[PDB]
């Protein structure tokens, strides 16, 4: 969700160096969200792998 | 006088035409802007244009 990504709901640009820096931002956005995913998707192979070895 | 007034006539063209050089109400010679920035990276890095008045 925005605010675990550090955008805010009521984020946006007024004018173009707040735009300039709201690259930034949404990068560090898109970074931080592909590493949480990564995160998830490694743990939910190893409950996979943890259920073929329970059966 | 004759040439004088056409002299001023020319003046005067000249002032119209550097007026009309806008591109989607922005210009690069009519003097309304030091400078323009366009974009160079997906960074945000900008490349640079200074601007020359006519």
Request: aromatic fraction near 6%; proline fraction near 0%; hydrophobic fraction near 40%.
């Amino acid at each position: 969700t925005l605010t675990g990504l550090g955008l805010t709901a009521s984020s946006t640009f007024t004018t173009a160096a707040a735009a300039k820096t709201m690259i930034g931002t949404i990068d560090t956005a898109l970074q931080t969200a592909t590493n949480k995913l990564a995160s998830l998707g490694t743990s939910s192979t190893g409950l996979d792998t943890h259920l073929t070895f329970v059966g | 006088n004759a040439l004088k007034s056409d002299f001023d006539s020319l003046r005067d063209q000249i002032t119209k035409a550097a007026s009309n050089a806008k591109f989607n109400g922005v210009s690069i010679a009519n003097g309304s802007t030091a400078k323009l920035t366009f974009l160079a990276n997906s960074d945000g890095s900008g490349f640079t244009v200074t601007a020359k008045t006519l």
